[PDB]
Amino acid sequence: MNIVVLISGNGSNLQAIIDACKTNKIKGTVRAVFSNKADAFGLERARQAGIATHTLIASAFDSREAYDRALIHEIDMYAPDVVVLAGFMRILSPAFVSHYAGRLLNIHPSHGTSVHFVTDELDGGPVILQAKVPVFAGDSEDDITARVQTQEHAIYPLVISWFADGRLKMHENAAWLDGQRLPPQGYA
């Protein structure tokens, strides 16, 4: 099970995925990490784990089209069974979304988190799993995030493990776990 992760920043979600794989909680291997931001910290986490990295800068190409074609060609050299977006800030082309249909995931910082199968250009599509984070009087916005971030590091690797296992699929713009079509709110 080949996993390719796309990032734009820090890479803390990427790290949680790397760790879940290292402990075999995810029956898969992160084969490469792609960044559209030069020197994103996540590239460093990938290097530290001995994973190949590639950076593609928009200003380095003639157009969005040229960029998207190069990104797809490069990702494809790694034969991904799953392409996971973890903080990848670029608006995707319909062609990219179509090319990875059924194997493109995204984690959404929305208080709660949710991971979806991406079926549109803004990283949207059917919800697979989501959780809620409670707030309390006294909570600092940086207390909220930390809780949310902790939550993301927990559910993304879990959802990816379902995929790596053959248990999770996308059909009719819906998510199916163990052959059961999940409801709009994901697995409950």
UniProtKB/Swiss-Prot annotation:
Q: EC number(s) for this protein?
A: 2.1.2.2
Q: What is this protein called?
A: Phosphoribosylglycinamide formyltransferase
Query: Is-annotated flag, keyword tRNA-binding?
Result: no
Q: What HAMAP family does the database record attribute to this sequence?
A: PurN
* Pathway the protein acts in: Purine metabolism; IMP biosynthesis via de novo pathway; N(2)-formyl-N(1)-(5-phospho-D-ribosyl)glycinamide from N(1)-(5-phospho-D-ribosyl)glycinamide (10-formyl THF route): step 1/1
**Active site per UniProt:** 108 (proton donor)
What result follows from mutating residue 123 to A/E/S/Y?
Reduces activity about 1000-fold
> What is this enzyme's class at the first EC digit?
transferase
